[PDB]
Design a protein around this nucleic acid. Structure first.
Lengths: 149, 82, 129, 186, 82, 206
RNA sequence: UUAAAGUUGCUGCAGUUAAAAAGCUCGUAGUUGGAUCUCUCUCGGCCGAAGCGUUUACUUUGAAAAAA
């Protein structure tokens, strides 16, 4: 059941049992990594690079071809962002709710909807401070967030 | 049911259901004991000997008595396979 | 959320002995489920079962005899010294003649009659009769 | 051609090395077999009279043995009598660390060198040209197990006769009993 | 009811179920092999694909995305991979 | 018919089944009866499998034959489409018919006038004559019922999947049950066909 | 004062209508958390030292636990 919603919805991806790279795929792991470096130099997230190779280049799982997954390729080449992918998209979303909120003060919908985006940020910042992906003094302050994204 | 001496301390030994191994009680009047004849192999007449099935009343009240007698006849080889 | 996978996999096979079924599906399986199920099978309560291996966490299909009255879990897994096993098997079991308490000792997941021989305490996992 | 970890050769794999040595002078595997080498070989019995020899490969060369596996099985089963050959990589088993251990594991054991993760990576490249597509373990009444390995339908007719020798080599080098199925569909 | 076979579902019974509620999770998608008629190339496209897949040579569209399944354009034929 | 070629369905019996229309079920399906179905066509009508039907007659005929006393079977219909078919089944077999209205308490109230104690019940339509069904579950009676697709299987024991709505399809099923009970018994056997026409068992509308 | 009292409930109660679920939601502490991994080096007469291994909870044994 979804965290800050009353919906108990079931929709996801179903990975197959056969874990091997299939027969027709004529891309080696070095060629896939070379594709990933260009698609990251274009300025895409790890969640967007895995889509482009699936749709156009026919790569089902990059973890199945290369042996490593997407983020551990970019963080080993060096072309990786400091704050992670999902924490960025929450901080960037809480900016646009907060930016729109100074225009319309009476909107008590997005005033409630800001706290849910707020309370998801501290759930992730706690996790990243625990796993030491973030420095242990990083805090979300509501005024500096226009220069974090 | 038995003591150390091996003698049997029981009023009687009740029959269990042929489908679900549940004990058919004394005052369970919705229960069944059904006889199904065996035919002769080459002419198809009544041999004399039969197969016996017992169905407890809760299964029969569920409506699962048709598909229990059937798949008990398919294991005894009375209904042809498929 | 699913706290206690052994709890949901025993009330899945409790609720189907009621309804008269001959097979259960119990997903997901841990290996505490397979040890517990093997103890019930060795005392004739269950019969043969098959572990379906998807790559995630297995499911088990268990063929049922009609011999199990009750299958239960104790939560939390309290610690049971061997001098305190009589109170547990008097609160949980129907008689002195049948029924078993499964506890996880350091010599393996076992009965209460096995744990008395090998002289071992453990943590109580559950019971069946 | 034979590289043992302790440099201990034996008359079994000497004939295997000499059999592989003609492949650098008769066939189209010239550029491949110069880089490759085996590490052990074992001729065992399965099936009451039938013989089958297993050939051990180092791990980082195993993927290069897959592209020339199906040719080398033909070129190696042709040159002597009926004896099924299978290529199993050489995987070290590190033992499960108890509460007492030596001062070697200051770095921890990788989970690739575990008995479960090696006892089914053996099974993947034992049956090589067909791939495992399902798996069902059955626990019998006496508590024994019996793995039922499903396989590919499309690669059936070249490995359909070997499935008694697969069970025997899996019994000997792992200990577990196994049966092989070819399902009709998904 | 009450004696199904859960180890061996029928192949139509497998395909009815949800892709996560099957006995083993099988995906409902595939990789097709689209052939644009105006060109001569072969571009492997996911079935349930998101944003549009352009040919490298002719630089035209192949499939614009939809709700579930990416619809091919006109003339684009495809032969399913294995 | 346990793989016996003496008891297998012949070419003439299927012509009778298709001429009466026993293979055409209703426009609904009970979930108990999905085992006996072949498929649903257009215009909703389920097509009842006929190799399944012929095995449930021959299961039921073994049940009737395995009773010694031929007048312990009690043969019941309340709709008038099976009221001629039951008096003629009980005439040739030997059973005891209750055609018409089954007053309740026939099997329970031992003081009553119409008290009897059968060993097996054969009814015709478990939707319609449910009152002999629920009253059987007080006195331990096994039960055959000539069942349609939308007719519920509670308290029945071997329910033949037929079409019990059409007047010809009921009389033919009673005819087949009478034929197989007499053939599997000691009477006139499987070589020559039964000289009792199945049109004797049909329902006569004014 | 104890049992009766499963009328204080850990074992072991109750909460639609009998007494009773906070108006709703977020949230720190607390409580609870899915699969997964099969003893050796320097000495003394092969048998003892010394070290462990990541740390514990658990369990079993031991010795220490005043008499009445």
């Amino acid at each position: 059941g979804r965290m800050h919603a009353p919906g108990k919805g079931l929709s996801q991806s179903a990975l197959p049992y056969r874990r091997s790279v299939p027969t027709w795929l004529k891309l080696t792991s070095d060629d896939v990594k070379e594709q990933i470096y260009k698609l990251a130099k274009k300025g895409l997230t790890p969640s967007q690079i895995g889509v482009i190779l699936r749709d156009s280049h026919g790569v089902a799982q990059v973890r199945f071809v290369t042996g490593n997954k997407i983020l551990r390729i970019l963080k080993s080449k060096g072309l990786a962002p400091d704050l992670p992918e999902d924490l960025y998209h929450l901080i960037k979303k809480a900016v646009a709710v907060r930016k729109h909120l100074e225009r319309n003060r009476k909107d008590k919908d997005a005033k409630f909807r800001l706290i849910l985006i707020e309370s998801r940020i501290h759930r992730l910042a706690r996790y990243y401070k625990t796993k030491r992906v973030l420095p242990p003094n990083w805090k979300y302050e509501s005024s500096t967030a226009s220069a974090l994204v | 049911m038995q003591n150390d001496a091996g003698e049997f301390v029981d009023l009687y030994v009740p029959r269990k259901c042929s489908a679900s191994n549940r004990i058919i009680g004394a005052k369970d009047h919705a229960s069944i004991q059904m006889n199904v004849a065996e035919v002769d192999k080459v002419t198809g007449r009544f041999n004399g000997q039969f197969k016996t099935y017992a169905i407890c009343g809760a299964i029969r009240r569920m409506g699962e008595s048709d598909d229990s007698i059937l798949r008990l006849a398919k294991a005894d080889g009375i209904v042809s396979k498929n | 959320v699913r706290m206690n996978v052994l709890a949901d996999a025993l009330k899945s096979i409790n609720n189907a002995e009621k309804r008269g079924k001959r097979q259960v599906l119990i997903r997901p399986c841990s290996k505490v489920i397979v040890r517990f199920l093997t103890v019930m099978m060795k005392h004739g309560y269950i019969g043969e079962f098959e572990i379906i291996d998807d790559h995630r966490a297995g499911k088990i299909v268990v063929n049922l005899t009609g011999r199990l009255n009750k299958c239960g879990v104790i939560s939390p897994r309290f610690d049971v010294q061997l001098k305190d096993l009589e109170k547990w098997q008097n609160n949980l079991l129907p008689s002195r003649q049948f029924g078993f308490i499964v506890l996880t000792t350091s010599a393996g997941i076992m009965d209460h009659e096995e744990a008395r021989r090998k002289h071992t305490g453990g943590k109580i996992l559950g019971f069946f009769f | 051609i034979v590289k043992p970890n302790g440099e201990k050769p034996d008359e079994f794999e000497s004939g295997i090395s000499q059999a592989l040595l003609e492949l650098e002078m008769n066939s189209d595997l010239k550029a491949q077999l110069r880089e490759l080498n085996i590490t052990a070989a074992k001729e065992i019995e399965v099936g009451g009279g039938r013989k089958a020899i297993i050939i051990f490969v180092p791990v980082p060369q195993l993927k290069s043995f897959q592209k020339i596996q199906v040719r080398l099985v033909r070129e190696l089963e042709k040159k002597f009598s009926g004896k099924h050959v299978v290529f199993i990589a050489q995987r070290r088993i590190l033992p499960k660390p108890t509460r007492k251990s030596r001062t070697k594991n200051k770095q921890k054991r990788p989970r690739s060198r575990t008995l479960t993760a090696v006892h089914d990576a053996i099974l993947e490249d034992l049956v090589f040209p067909s791939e495992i597509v399902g798996k069902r373990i059955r626990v019998k009444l006496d508590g024994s197990r019996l793995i039922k390995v499903h396989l590919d339908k499309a690669q059936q007719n070249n490995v359909e006769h070997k499935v008694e020798t697969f069970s025997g080599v899996y019994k000997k080098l792992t200990g577990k009993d196994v049966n092989f199925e070819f399902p009709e569909f998904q | 009811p009450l004696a199904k076979d859960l180890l061996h579902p029928s192949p139509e019974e497998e395909k009815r179920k949800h892709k996560k509620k099957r006995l083993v999770q099988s995906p409902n998608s595939y990789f097709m092999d689209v052939k644009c008629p105006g060109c001569y190339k072969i571009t492997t496209v996911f079935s349930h694909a998101q944003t549009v897949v352009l040919c490298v040579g002719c630089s035209t569209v192949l499939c614009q995305p939809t709700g579930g399944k990416a619809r091919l354009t006109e003339g684009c034929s495809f032969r399913r991979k294995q | 018919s346990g793989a016996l070629d003496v008891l297998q369905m012949k070419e003439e019996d299927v012509l009778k089944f298709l001429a009466a229309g026993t293979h055409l079920g209703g426009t609904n399906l009970d979930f108990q009866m999905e085992q006996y179905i072949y498929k649903r066509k257009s215009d909703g009508i389920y097509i009842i499998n006929l190799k399944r039907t012929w095995e449930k007659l021959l299961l039921a005929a073994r049940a009737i034959v395995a009773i010694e006393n031929p007048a312990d079977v009690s043969v019941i219909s309340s709709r008038n489409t099976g009221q001629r078919a039951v008096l003629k089944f009980a005439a040739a077999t030997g059973a005891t018919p209750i055609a018409g209205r089954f007053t309740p308490g026939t099997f329970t109230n031992q003081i009553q006038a119409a008290f009897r104690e059968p060993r097996l019940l054969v009814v015709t339509d478990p939707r319609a004559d449910h009152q002999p069904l629920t009253e059987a579950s007080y006195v331990n009676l096994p039960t055959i019922a000539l069942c349609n697709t939308d007719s519920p299987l509670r308290y029945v024991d071997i329910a033949i999947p037929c079409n019990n709505k059409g007047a010809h399809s009921v009389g033919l099923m009673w005819w087949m049950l009478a034929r197989e009970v007499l053939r599997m018994r000691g009477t006139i056997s499987r070589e020559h066909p039964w000289e009792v026409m199945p049109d004797l068992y049909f329902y006569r509308d004014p």
